[model samples]
Target: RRETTDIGGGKYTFELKGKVGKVVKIAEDHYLVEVEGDKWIAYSDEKLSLGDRVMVVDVDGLKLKVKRIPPQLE
Candidate 1:
């Protein structure tokens, strides 16, 4: 979070993105994402699980968005 900051008028110095990881639940309406060997707290738009590989993205709101990566073709 400290890596980015709001300059003003809905702008920030940079947008934060994390490496690929899996989504794990922490509590209701809350989740613990295991990314880069650390558990990040995030809010999910819908129910998610370890079946989906994801990355956390910083947006305009307090909660982050989880981007699902499609499975690689064999």
Candidate 2:
């Protein structure tokens, strides 16, 4: 879950830390993940794949630092 605050001057802020999402798209150095019904662009040092589950570890502006979540054993 995320909340937004209007700081006036047409600016707003929100949080994404500790949120879990799914990787829907991937690029050379970025990924598109769906978190809380919203899409975010993130970059990671480790390789990722489509349909991978991830968690937001860090955030900076529109860029996010995402870490892959290992699949749970069935």
Candidate 3:
């Protein structure tokens, strides 16, 4: 994700990527995820459920794409 800040007539942008988060809520088309104590709504094509862990793959402004990660234990 790219964050832009305006300071003293100039703008600075930074990129943040590949954050692992947990699903807290779900909708018909999106999932509400929590990453680094912040909540973000992310979209995914794969099947996901509550409490699943996902990695943020792409971000454009407020839009996000995420992928599910397999559980470490069986």
Give stretches of model 2 more than 4 Å off.
1-13
TM-score of 2: 0.73
Residue 62 in candidate 3, Cα distance off native in Å: 1.1
What is the C-alpha lDDT profile of model 2 across 1-74, one tens digit per residue?
Answer: 47878557722134667888888888876689777777788887887888999998977877668899887883
Please write out the lDDT profile of model 1 over residues 1-74, one tens digit for every residue: 56777457743222336557677654565777666555566767666765567777663443456676677892
Question: Runs in model 1 with CA error above 4 Å?
Answer: 1-18, 59-63
| lDDT of the candidates, in the order given | 0.61, 0.79, 0.71
lDDT of 3 by residue, 3-24 (tens): 8674555221212248788888
Ranking by TM-score: 2, 3, 1
TM-score of each: 0.56, 0.73, 0.69
RMSD, each candidate, Å? 7.5, 5.1, 6.3
Report how far off residue 74 is in candidate 3 (Å).
6.3
- Best-matching candidate per TM-score: 2
Error of 3 at 19 (Å): 1.0
**Arranged by lDDT, best first:** 2, 3, 1
